[PDB]
Amino acid sequence: DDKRFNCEAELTLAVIGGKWKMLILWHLGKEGTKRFNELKTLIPDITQKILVNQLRELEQDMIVHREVYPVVPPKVEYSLTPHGESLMPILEAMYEWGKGYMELIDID
Amino acid sequence: DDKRFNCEAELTLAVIGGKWKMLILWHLGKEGTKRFNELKTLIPDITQKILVNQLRELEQDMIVHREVYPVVPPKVEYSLTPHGESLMPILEAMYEWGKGYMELIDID
C-alpha cells in the first residue's frame, strides 16, 4: 500500500523528470505531431545531442511514438502514445501549481 | 511562454522530488496532522536524520507547517500548508498514472 503508492508515484517522476522532457511532451500534447527540427526550433536552448537522447528515452519508455513515413520526401514524426497523453493533465496541473508557487517565492 | 511553462513545471518537480517527500505529503494530506514519530512509523525505511531533513526542506519550502504546542506534554505537529494541499491532486494523479504504467512495464 505505502510501498505501492511510493513505487508508483516515483516511477512517474522518473519518466517525466529532468530539464527537457516535460517541455517536449507539452508541445507534443498541445500542438500535436512534430518533426525533430520543429521541436529543436521550439526549444532553442536544447542541443541536437540532448534532444535526440530525450526523445530516445521517451520512445523507449513508451511515452513518445516515432514513426518513419516513406513518402516523398520521407519524414520522421514524433507524437504522444496513449500513455503520454494521460501525462498531459499532470503536466498541466504542475504548470498551474508552479506558476502560483513561483509568484509566492519571487514576490515573497 | 515556453520558458514560463518550463521554469514553473520544473519548480514543482524540485519541491516534490526525491525518495520520500511525496510519501510524507501523501500521509499528511490523506490522514491529517502527524507528530514526527507517527511519520517515522508510517515510513519504516526512513531514518531519523533523513525524515528530519525532508521535513525541514518541506517546511522551508512552505509546503509543511510545523507547529509547537506548549500543552501538557508539549507536542510538535506537522501538517500541510495551503500550498501543500494543492499538491495533493497532483500526487493522486501521479500515483494513478504510475500504477497503470508499472503494470505495463512489469507484465510487458
Residue numbers in the entry:
A (entry chain A), B (entry chain A): 5 to 112
What does the report in the manuscript say about this coordinate set?
Although with a higher basal level on DNA binding and transcriptional activation, the K13A mutant (HxlR-K13A) also remained insensitive to FA. The 1.7-Å-resolution HxlR-K13A structure exhibited a more optimal conformation for DNA binding than HxlR-WT but had less significant changes than that of HxlR-WT-FA-DNA. Particularly, helix α1 does not break at Cys11 in the HxlR-K13A structure and residues Cys11 and Ala13 are located on the opposite sides of an intact helix α1, indicating that the absence of “N-terminal helix-flipping” might be the main reason why HxlR-K13A does not undertake the conformation as HxlR-WT-FA-DNA. Further inspection at the N-terminus of HxlR-K13A revealed that the sidechain of Phe9 is located between Trp29’ and Tyr99’ on the dimer interface.
Both FA-treated and -untreated HxlR adopt an overall topology similar to the previously reported MarR/DUF24 family proteins that bind DNA in a dimeric form, with each monomer consisting of dimerization domain (helices α1 and α5) and winged helix-turn-helix (wHTH) DNA-binding domain (helices α2, α3, α4, and β-strands). Our study on the FA-sensing transcription factor HxlR revealed that FA induced a specific intrahelical crosslinking reaction between residues Cys11 and Lys13. The resulting methylene bridge (Cys-CH2-Lys) on HxlR’s helix α1 caused unwinding and rotation of its N-terminus (“N-terminal helix-flipping”) that allosterically rotated its DNA-binding domain with enhanced DNA affinity and transcriptional activation.
